[PDB]
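Subject: Sanity check before I submit

Could someone independently write out the structure tokens for this chain? I want to compare against mine line by line before I put it in a report. The sequence has 115 residues.
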Amino acid sequence: AAGSHMAAEYKFPDPIPEFAEAETEKFRDHMLNKLSKRDLFEDSVDEIVGVCTEIFETFLRSEYGGPGTLLVIPFIDMADTLNERELPGGPQAARAAIKWAQDHVDKDWKEWTGT
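---
Independent answer below. Compare away.
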């Protein structure tokens, strides 16, 4: 954080697979509920949520180590994957995903880790 200090002074938390799993369940349940109500996703909610959830969990499991590490790239990956598979609503789903993640992930990490 401050360049003159010793590297040994800065311990950063590793990603936590149990947090990734628990937070992915909350994300999935939010996304299923939010997208289910809308004609745009009527026949594809499960598939679209499945794409978003897989990308989200993979990022939390390997890459998320608390505040300062939730990158935008998984949400770009969600829109790109939905666009590649010609699933309608890519921008809408990725925006729902990033809004929820912005609102919850760091806060939930602090609560889950007790920090």
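---
OP: Matches mine. For the report I'm noting this point. The chain has one domain: 15-113.
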